[PDB]
Amino acid sequence: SKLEAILSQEVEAEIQALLQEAEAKAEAVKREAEEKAKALLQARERALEAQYRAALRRAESA
Amino acid sequence: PVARRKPEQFIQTGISTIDVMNTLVRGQKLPIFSGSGLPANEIAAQIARQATVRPDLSGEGEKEEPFAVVFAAMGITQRELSYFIQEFERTGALSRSVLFLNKADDPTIERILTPRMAL
Question: How many angstroms from the chain centroid is the CA of residue B116?
């Protein structure tokens, strides 16, 4: 009765915490990836570009 | 002495050691004390590739200066030799340089001739 009303509401607010909790931890993983990759594609851009200009230099000097 | 003008510029050599404490002024006499079986040469070469004036604290740079070196040893091992060469071509600053080479195997005496010749 009133017994089951309180039991519902008690369980229901816990439901609301599980669902959001998993989700945000998923999104943060998702967003970690976006950063992780971005810094890598940048890092290999950097290195190759310098090794390009400098490479041509050694040729130019030849 | 009257003809000499006091030093006043310095370069960035890329190692703090010098570049903070001691300050490698242009046209200086710097001896680097080492022992055998220590990294004598390497460290020298580093300087050769990072040596550069500072326009930032002035108004004058390498837009007003090129750069160059003259190297000689006076006999060395072989192992030091080639090792040396590969850092001039990969910098490529070899062109603008002069090499005197006596290898440690020629008649000994020409140890005392050679410095001056280059100098």
Answer: 16
Which residues 32-61 of A have a C-beta within 8 angstroms of B?
A: 57-58, 60-61
Per-window interface: B 55-114 vs A, CB < 8 A? 89-90, 92, 94-95
Contact A61 B94 (CB under 8 A): yes
Q: Which amino acid is at B38?
A: L
Q: Look-up: residue for tokens 């002069």? A: B98
Classify A48 as helix, strand or coil: helix
Token look-up 């000689």 returns B72
Phi (first) and psi of residue B52, to 5 degrees: -165, 140
- Tracing tokens 């440690």 back to the chain, one arrives at B104
Closest CA to B75 of B44, B109, B36, B33: B109
This PDB structure is determined at a resolution in Å of 5.0
For tokens 């990072």, the residue is B50
Distance from C-alpha of B112 to C-alpha of B20, rounded to nearest angstrom: 36
Please state, in angstroms and rounded to a whole number, the distance separating the CA atoms of residues B108 and B74.
Answer: 10
Cα–Cα distance measured from residue B92 to residue A54, given in angstroms and rounded to the nearest whole number: 10
All structural domains of chain A, each given as residue ranges with its CATH number in brackets, are 1-62 (1.20.5.620)
